[PDB]
Amino acid sequence: GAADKPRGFARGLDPERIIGATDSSGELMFLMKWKDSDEADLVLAKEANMKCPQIVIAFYEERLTWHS
Amino acid sequence: GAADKPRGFARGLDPERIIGATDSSGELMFLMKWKDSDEADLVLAKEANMKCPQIVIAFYEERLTWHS
Amino acid sequence: PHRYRPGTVALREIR
């Protein structure tokens, strides 16, 4: 709602690790764990790609799976 | 040899798109297509991660699978 | 020399 600010990247925190993902709205989002904070937030993947690409990469790298 | 052909990023070309990935050697590598080249070649993921993070992200985004 | 493998990013929908 209008007063639920700041949220996500607007909290000014340093991204630590992506811990989850969702597509329920049509746009990909990441559940972001921030350094030194217990509360993880949803952030747009498009925003994370811009703001913390290495964090995005690390998330994908950890979930890369080979198939046979 | 002293005069081995430059490979990968050392060739000074602009990356275009990652074609595929493999961790055969124990290091994760990408088959990189370069702009205006028909001559793809293997680069380390850690190197691609730093030099063209948006290309690495685009690769992983193309290959998201939802297990649940 | 330019073989590559079948690999995906295995995600789990939160919802």
Domain of B58: which CATH number? 2.40.50.40
- With vertex at residue A64, the alpha carbon angle to CA A46 and CA B61, rounded to the nearest 5 degrees, is 25
Resolution rounded to one decimal, in angstroms: 1.6
Cα Rg, chain A, nearest whole Å: 13
Decide if C10 and A65 are in contact by the 8 Å CB cutoff.
yes
How many structural domains does chain B have? Answer: 1
From CA A7, how far away is CA B8, in angstroms rounded? Answer: 40
Tokens at A26, concatenated: 């049509």
Task: Indicate the angle between helix axes A53-63 and B53-61, nearest 10 degrees.
Answer: 40
Strand order in the sheet with B41-44: B15-22, B29-34, B41-44
Residue in C7, C13, C14 nearest the CB of A65: C7
Burial degree of C12 (CB within 10 A; 0-12, 13-18, 19+): exposed
Q: For chain A, list the strands marked E by DSSP.
A: 15-22, 29-34, 41-44, 64-66
Is some CB atom of chain B closer than 8 A to the CB atom of A60?
yes
Report DSSP state, residue A24.
T
Q: Provide the chain A residues 5-44 that lie in CB contact (below 8 A) with chain B.
A: 23, 28
Instruction: Say how many C-beta atoms besides its own lie within 10 A of residue B58's C-beta.
Output: 13
Method: X-ray
Residue pair A57/B45 in contact (Cβ under 8 Å)? The answer is no
CB-CB contact of B41 with B52 (8 Å): no
Full domain range(s) for residue B52: 1-68
In terms of Cβ atoms closer than 10 Å to its own Cβ (0-12, 13-18, 19+), residue A45 is buried
